[PDB]
Design a protein around this ligand. Sequence first.
Ligand SMILES: OC[C@H]1O[C@@H](O[C@@H]2[C@@H](O)[C@H](O)O[C@H](CO)[C@H]2O)[C@H](O)[C@@H](O)[C@@H]1O
Length: 409
Amino acid sequence: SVKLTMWIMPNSDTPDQDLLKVVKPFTDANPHITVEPTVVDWSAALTKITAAATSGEAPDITQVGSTWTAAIGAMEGALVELTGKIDTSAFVESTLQSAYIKGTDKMFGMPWFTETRALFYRKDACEKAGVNPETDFATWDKFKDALKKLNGIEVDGKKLAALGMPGKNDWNVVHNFSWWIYGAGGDFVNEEGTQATFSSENALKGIKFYSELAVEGLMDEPSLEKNTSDIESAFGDGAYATAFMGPWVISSYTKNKEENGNDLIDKIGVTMVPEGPAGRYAFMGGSNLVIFNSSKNKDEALELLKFFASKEAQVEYSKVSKMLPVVKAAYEDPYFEDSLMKVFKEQVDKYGKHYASVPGWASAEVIFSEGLSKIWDNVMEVDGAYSYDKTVQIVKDVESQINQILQET
Ligand SMILES: OC[C@H]1O[C@@H](O[C@@H]2[C@@H](O)[C@H](O)O[C@H](CO)[C@H]2O)[C@H](O)[C@@H](O)[C@@H]1O
């Protein structure tokens, strides 16, 4: 007998159950293998995985944020090198770069699922505001015009803010800036992933355009006090006409209707992020699976990773979590005719961009999460009036620390 244990990060209200619903076909076909999941929340996962990699007090397998894979894989003796042990031909090509350490041929993770952030909107709010959501969000400038018409629009006598986005420190702080920087024609690092470049003229143009949506009263300023989960909940309670969110919120809003009669789910659509002067760009994230080098059943652990990559497990995991599969064949399933999920798939395939898969990137995100949240503190005027000039200084200070981190490699 073999007791396979794995850590998972939560994106639903029942993560352990969702997972067991997906691996049940595997366990029914391998009676000598048991699988026990354990939840590790996102804010603790990097610290916990890093500690477990060196102490050996670890499960056999852990989910890992795609942007962290290289950081963990670069830890000597931390993970099983998967190079050649998994068949990557079946995978969506673009998902594989985050499974390797950039500049090496070393694959330390297997892509598990993909996610991007799309523009959710209230159909009823748009109709009343005279906003056509199929056309009026297409570009930065049209998006901004639409927000002005949606600002303070009322549905059933309650005012909505035009755009609700979090500003508090969680991992999504940098993710929510990413595609504004990209769409302006900037990037976080050079091609090699070895120096920071997000104080460039173009990067700052994107930072200024996005952050000043709140200065101008279009993005809701009080919501910048809150984190992603709180703003997701607020949108589900009707607080905002629009919000940029991942696909998993659809599970939450569907449950809110089933349990509470909250019909928000029936009032929303989703469209791609607005196009900037560089063309359209979107955040590409998701998670990979890795096998700890300390695993005493690497044969079974590797067997379980291959099952998670099977067409049926990918379809079923996508159904329960709303995440996108990383296996091309899953998308032939009728389920992906869904009007909302189609948007996330088209956006990530055509316009998705993932960070450089470098070992220092995980540590960089810690600095991004604290550093860039100071931009929202500036906008929120908690220490003096807002000024763009203070944002520029915040960004330059973050860049210096990122460069020192990248130089450790
Ligand atoms: O930056 C770490 C990893 O973040 C992942 O995004 C998570 C979101 O899906 C979730 O909704 O919120 C948490 C924070 O509470 C985010 O960490 C990305 O999918 C990964 O690509 C990324 O490595």
